[PDB]
Amino acid sequence: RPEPELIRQSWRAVSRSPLEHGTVLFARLFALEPDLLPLFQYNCRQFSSPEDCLSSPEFLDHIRKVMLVIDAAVTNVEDLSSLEEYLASLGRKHRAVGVKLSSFSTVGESLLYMLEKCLGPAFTPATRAAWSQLYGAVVQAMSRGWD
Amino acid sequence: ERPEPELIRQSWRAVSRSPLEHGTVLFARLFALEPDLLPLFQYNCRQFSSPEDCLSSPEFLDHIRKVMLVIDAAVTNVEDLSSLEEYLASLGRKHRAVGVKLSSFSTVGESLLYMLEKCLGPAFTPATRAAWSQLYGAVVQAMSRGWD
């Protein structure tokens, strides 16, 4: 299990303003994997129109949802196995809308970048490792959707 | 037995056009039946006066988003709801821990049907009503396991 106290304490820095911190995660995501941008712009096209996609209700609602799923991983940090079936269903939904499984690895890198910006020196190697472990467990359960 | 998938998918698309409004409908009905559930969302909205101010609290609104995500998962796995059984039992355990009485989940069922009836109107046909009753029936059965 990822160290529960390290996870809970560090998550409090970002969890209460999910769009402020979530937009940081997604800005990093696009800087590391620019090719993801057309996938969101096309999703925006389906919802309404692609203009101002990164300010759109569907794009910001998606950030809120990513932050909510990360919060569930935090509240279930002691036994992440219980989320496995929920996450497998979410992973299968992503594959069905055309998201690459490899893009989830960039989300992990972006999650660590967002946390470090907020925590600075409090983001110790132990805390970074805990988050690496927690996110690893999340992406592993979501990857079941690729079965 | 198994909730008719197309009736579930079709009706859920309509309700997820406005999740915050429709989720608020579900909780408004639930609070009219069991007003004592509202304080469970007041941990950062500590007021006995005008407690409706707390329906605009982030914890209440994020919880609506959480409820919609769970239903979204039940809709995605509508062809095999047993696939969510261990997750739902753990989710049941979490609700028992915050102090939700097991009987309050029968009231959630009534509130869900009320919410679906309000937003769907004539589209909430006897067949669509039966599919949602079967879907909630399966969800609440797995959730009840969290009480042991």
Ligand code: HEM
């Ligand atoms: C890897 C980068 C990702 C991309 C390109 C992506 C894309 C999408 C798309 C296109 C949708 C459907 C429409 C929408 O909700 O705006 C979606 C839904 C969703 N995503 Fe993502 N997503 C990604 C990562 C994630 C991650 C990491 C999480 C959670 C940890 C997440 C959670 C969700 C949720 C909860 C939904 C709603 C699914 C549903 O409608 O049932 N997404 N995502």
Ligand code: HEM
């Ligand atoms: C009487 C009805 C209910 C009450 C009073 C209630 C109350 C709560 C409270 C107090 C929490 C903990 C704080 C929070 O995460 O927001 C919570 C969490 C949660 N609730 Fe509910 N809830 C109810 C119904 C439901 C239903 C019907 C669903 C799903 C269909 C649901 C899904 C969730 C989820 C996903 C969590 C997060 C649990 C976790 O962190 O793993 N709730 N609920």
